[PDB]
Write a protein that binds this DNA or RNA. Structure first.
Ligand SMILES: CC[C@H]1OC(=O)[C@H](C)[C@@H](O[C@H]2C[C@@](C)(OC)[C@@H](O)[C@H](C)O2)[C@H](C)[C@@H](O[C@@H]2O[C@H](C)C[C@H](N(C)C)[C@H]2O)[C@](C)(O)C[C@@H](C)C(=O)[C@H](C)[C@@H](O)[C@]1(C)O
Lengths: 7, 209, 56, 122, 120, 114
RNA sequence: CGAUGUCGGCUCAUCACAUCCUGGGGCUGAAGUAGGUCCCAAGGGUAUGGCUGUUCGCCAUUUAAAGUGGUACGCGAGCUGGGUUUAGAACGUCGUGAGACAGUUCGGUCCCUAUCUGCCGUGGGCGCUGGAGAACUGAGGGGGGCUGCUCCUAGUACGAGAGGACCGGAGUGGACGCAUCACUGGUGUUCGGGUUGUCAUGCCAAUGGCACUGCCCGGUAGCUAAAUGCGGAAGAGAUAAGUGCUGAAAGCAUCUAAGCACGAAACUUGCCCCGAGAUGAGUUCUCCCUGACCCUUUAAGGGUCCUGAAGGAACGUUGAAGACGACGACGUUGAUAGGCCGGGUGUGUAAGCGCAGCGAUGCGUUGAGCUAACCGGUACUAAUGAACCGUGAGGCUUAACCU
RNA sequence: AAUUCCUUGUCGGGUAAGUUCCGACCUGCACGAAUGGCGUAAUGAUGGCCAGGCUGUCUCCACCCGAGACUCAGUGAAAU
RNA sequence: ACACAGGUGGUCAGGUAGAGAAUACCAAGGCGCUUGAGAGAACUCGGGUGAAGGAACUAGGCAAAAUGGUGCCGUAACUUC
RNA sequence: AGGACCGAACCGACUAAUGUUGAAAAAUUAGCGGAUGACUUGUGGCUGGGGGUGAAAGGCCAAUCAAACCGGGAGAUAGCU
């Protein structure tokens, strides 16, 4: 693829 | 006109009456002996071919020797051509001294630059150095981007990159001639010519004003 | 960074065109003892250029 | 070698005391001023009376640089500190009227004559 | 980038190097022969041969110097009494390097270095 | 440097007296003032010396009108003309760079008197 | 959608021209200085800061100028991760509530050792038609192409004044570039010295280890920029817009249809560098090889004995050459490296002994002692006598000379 | 303003120049009194702003010492 | 998962300097870490020094640099004293 | 006297760089906080899965957590690939 990104 | 082959002994000042320091490279210029003349008949062009130093007999090969044989031998360091232009010279080891430059004010000078071997960008091309700090991750002297994206989809030719630096030809041009000294074989040109102490040098009167 | 296609058996060989070894030829004989040896090196017995240095 | 930022001391009255170089005039991207070059300046200190006051923006003449000066023959003159003479923004030309500490021969300019006429040395 | 520099590095630091060539000078002046890698051998010369030279003139000082290097009274002793006079007449080149070549454990290129008149 | 050296020593002054770091020399240098070619005297402490044949220089530190000024003369330059020692310094130290951090009463150097 | 990392910055760029500056023009409501506008021009050049995440924009101050665009709004397998920012939290706001909000605020893992293409370098192979060592020719390619200010022309032309030229000279700068260490300096853990703590060499005295080179003051060579030399050009060709000469078609006029002249940092050259794999593999000089014999399907045929050149390579000592290859110097008929002798340079008056002093310490002998990569010298050591590779006159055809 | 969209509001201060900061105004898009209001000495690896010192953070990078990178010998992976 | 720079409670504790179980150098004792040998490039990692300038860097002084002991003298707003 | 002060052991984990097919499935180095207390630690005990425990983060309950793991219903169902 984670979910980390752108978006 | 033509020019000569010398040897960088190199670099010292000479002071003047009214108190000025003239930095000069000291070029030793032993007499150049023409080993061959060339002509539009024996195709091509008008040029002379000199040698200047002295070489160990056991180091001179048969061919090199046989070539020196035509004309006054005493094999020198190497050979060099100068193109001609309505000046003329007969081969019988004509021998050309530093005499040549008594009246010359100019002189160009060409050495073989000191060998840096590598450098990479920054040294080689004065590339800027990335943040030394501020989060930079292993990219301090690296070259950074080297192309665009899909559309060139390649790196263009001649891109400035890391690689061999120096130990190549390079000449300097202009260079006031400070002193000419026959029977000493000296030539003081004002300041700084390429290549290291001891290395071979070619000086010619300057092509530019 | 990784290949997108298996390099071939051919390509492998190519890369190794230079990986091959050289013999010696410059193997030379001591003037006193018999002795083959590397040039400018002591012999098995301790001779070098005729003289006997090294007892070992 | 003076460059933007860099505090300079002042070698005249006018009353500046401490001053900061905010531009090396005279060319695009010109890095350093020294010797006897001109620089834009913002007053940082200023005595209470004085021709100038703190916060003013003027020009000034580098008169002593610690990196000093060379000229012919190969010698060097170095001064322990960096000092300048304030100039009026339009006319160059010192706004002061007395010079302090030695100044150098290089300054032998038409416009800077008033400085070397004043000034107790070189 | 090394132009005209002098002095090998042998993948150590100044300290390590200094102490090693000290131990080795000893090991040479003592045994008069040692087996060592050719690089290490060649450098050894620039340590030892000066010592022998130094010894050619006996004084209190010259001994005390020969002790600030090497740091072994037995060898400052063998010099001066033995090697000093033993070469008192020799221009230089008190040693010679003979190469056997290629240690087993690591393929290191090898060589003997002896005092030149070893004879014994 | 054998063909140099020759070129060089045939330019070197010979009258130069001997001085030493610490000495309080006065160098009298030529100066085209403006219209007049006169002599000008620089007197200060020798704080460092050259010692390279033709290229020999030295640094003299003056403390003028407030804060110091240093001059490096190339000793063998025409523009120098005269140089006399005027006081003998007791320092034991080849370069007196430390003086730069001193000021007046704190920067005095003893007579060498021997 | 079995994954095409999305804003700005940084580093590096690259094209277009609708040209910001520099260049050449027409018109001007162009007197001059200076503008405006259109045409031609893409060779080079084209700002540091304040604020903000910004791009931008405003502001300060420069500058000849601070150009507009394309390149996945160039540039995450180059960096940054401030701004979009999921797991925390709070404000305002909406909601009964869970929560929600281009409202906002504080906080918050940025992988990949490069197979391929490309690209910067650098070798190996074979070719180039006997082999070999040099020196060349230059198809072709790349590099470079910026500009200020002052003085003279001249306070002249012009202008009522104020102001203030074209054209042409001369200096001297900015930014950029190449080279080099003579000067000025940086570094200099391989030189010398000072000094703290402690351990050791039996002890005094003198020295060594360890503490970031223990801390630090100097500093040789080398490498170097802030150091100091040099460069952009002049000239020539053919042109752009433009201006002409002569000139009919069209009795005239007209730069054009014939014909002729001017004309710009663009073009082709001139300058610097690379360069015959230029398979279209070029030229020139020099060196080297002048033995026997057999077999068949008898031909650029295969082989046996002799022979082994010019040269090359290997090995060794090696270099201001170098990742490795490579390139240069040298191998005893020898200065290639180390050592050694003398000098220099650095440090700054060693140790020992004497004198003074209660002593710390001072002075004398003593500008001593020590001194790297430097300089000039020197066969003391190490570079061996050889072996290895490479051959033994070099295709056919036609032509021209001669036999 | 941890609340203000319009908004870099407006005025004052600091800077050569300040969308942040400090002080004010009040037009509070959409503070407010125990889902506490306004203050507060001291404390804080708390947020924002400033200055002296300091400096290779920067102008602009140079040299040096060590560990890799490169060469030889031995062993000998990986994703795709 | 390894002959893995990690985690693992208790006990003993010498000399010189030191307030010290900090720290530096040592004793008793224990080790040199199971690839080495050469080269002295780019780049990367970890360190040292730097002309003139001194935050111009940058989202931000991030990082570096600096400060650094003991005794005495001396020390502002404010303050819940 | 003190959830008092400076500071090792011990307990923590604010910044950075390194590391990211690691030396290590969270560490190393340099700095950093606490250090007589709501401190820290060895041994042993009790709490169980819509349940525990929680100075509260949806934290932790064996490298697993908006409902642990093991076996079973079991070939759940899959208008989807
Ligand atoms: C250290 C070791 C780990 O690396 C990191 O964590 C880096 C730093 C992540 O970036 C981190 C950090 C960051 C910024 O990604 C760059 C963040 O956006 C993502 C979500 O996580 C990467 C790359 C993530 O990929 C990215 O995931 C995105 C959904 C799409 C993106 N893609 C389109 C290109 C893709 O590459 C992702 C999923 O972890 C890759 C998958 C295969 C893995 O799980 C593998 C095992 C990784 O954990 C890892 C390599 O072992």
């Amino acid at each position: 693829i984670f979910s980390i990104f752108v978006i | 006109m033509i020019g000569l082959v010398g040897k960088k002994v190199g670099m010292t000042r000479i002071f003047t009456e009214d108190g000025v320091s003239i930095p000069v490279t000291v070029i030793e210029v032993e007499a150049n002996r023409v080993t061959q003349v060339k002509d539009l008949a024996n195709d091509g062009y008008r040029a002379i071919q000199v040698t200047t130093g002295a070489k160990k007999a056991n180091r001179v090969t048969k061919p090199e020797a046989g070539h020196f044989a035509k004309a006054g031998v005493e094999a020198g360091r190497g050979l060099w051509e100068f193109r001609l232009a309505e000046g003329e010279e007969f081969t019988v080891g004509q021998s050309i001294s530093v005499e040549l430059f008594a009246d010359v004010k100019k002189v160009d000078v060409t050495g073989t630059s000191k060998g840096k071997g590598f450098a990479g960008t920054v040294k080689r091309w004065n590339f800027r150095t990335q943040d030394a700090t501020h989060g930079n991750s292993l990219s301090h002297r690296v070259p950074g981007s080297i192309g665009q994206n899909q559309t060139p989809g390649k790196v263009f030719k001649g891109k400035k990159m890391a690689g061999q630096m120096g130990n190549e030809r390079v000449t300097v041009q202009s260079l006031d001639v400070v002193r000419v000294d026959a029977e000493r074989n000296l030539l003081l040109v004002k300041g700084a010519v390429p290549g290291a102490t001891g290395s071979d040098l070619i000086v010619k009167p300057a092509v530019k004003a | 960074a990784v290949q997108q296609n298996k390099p071939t058996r051919s390509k492998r060989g190519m890369r190794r065109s230079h990986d091959a070894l050289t013999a010696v030829t410059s193997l030379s004989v001591d003037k006193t003892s018999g002795e083959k040896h590397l040039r400018h090196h002591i012999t098995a017995d301790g001779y070098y250029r005729g003289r006997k240095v090294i007892a070992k | 070698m003076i460059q933007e930022q860099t505090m300079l001391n002042v070698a005249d009255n006018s009353g500046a005391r401490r001053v900061m170089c905010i531009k090396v005039l005279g060319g695009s991207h010109r890095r350093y001023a020294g010797v006897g070059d001109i620089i834009k300046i913002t007053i940082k200190e200023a005595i209470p009376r004085g021709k100038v006051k703190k916060g003013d923006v003027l020009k000034a003449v580098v008169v002593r640089t610690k990196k000093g000066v060379r000229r012919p023959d190969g010698s060097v003159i170095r001064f322990d500190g960096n000092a300048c003479v304030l100039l009026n923004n339009n006319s160059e030309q010192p706004i002061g009227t007395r010079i302090f500490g030695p100044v150098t021969r290089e300054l032998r300019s038409e416009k800077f004559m008033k400085i070397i006429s004043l000034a107790p040395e070189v | 980038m090394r132009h005209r520099k002098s002095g090998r590095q042998l993948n150590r630091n100044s300290s390590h190097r200094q102490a090693m060539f000290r131990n080795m000078a000893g090991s040479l002046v003592r045994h008069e022969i040692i087996k060592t890698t050719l690089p290490k051998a060649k450098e050894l010369r620039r340590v030892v041969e000066p010592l022998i030279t130094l010894a050619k003139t006996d004084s209190v000082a010259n001994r005390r110097l020969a002790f600030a290097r090497t740091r072994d009274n037995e060898i400052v002793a063998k010099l001066f009494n033995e090697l000093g006079p033993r070469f008192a007449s020799r221009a230089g080149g008190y040693t010679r390097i003979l190469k056997c070549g290629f240690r087993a454990g690591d393929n290191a290129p090898m060589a003997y270095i002896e005092l030149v008149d070893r004879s014994e | 440097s054998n063909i140099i050296k020759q070129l060089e020593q045939e330019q070197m002054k010979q009258d130069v007296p001997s001085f030493r770091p610490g000495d309080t020399v006065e160098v009298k240098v030529w100066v085209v003032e403006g219209s007049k070619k006169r002599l000008q005297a620089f007197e200060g402490v020798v704080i460092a010396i050259r010692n390279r044949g033709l290229h020999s220089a030295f640094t003299v530190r003056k403390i003028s009108n407030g804060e110091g000024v240093e001059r490096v003369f190339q000793t063998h330059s025409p523009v120098v003309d005269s140089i006399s020692v005027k006081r003998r310094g007791a320092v034991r130290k080849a370069k007196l760079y430390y003086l730069r951090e001193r000021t007046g009463k704190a920067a005095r150097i003893k007579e060498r008197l021997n």
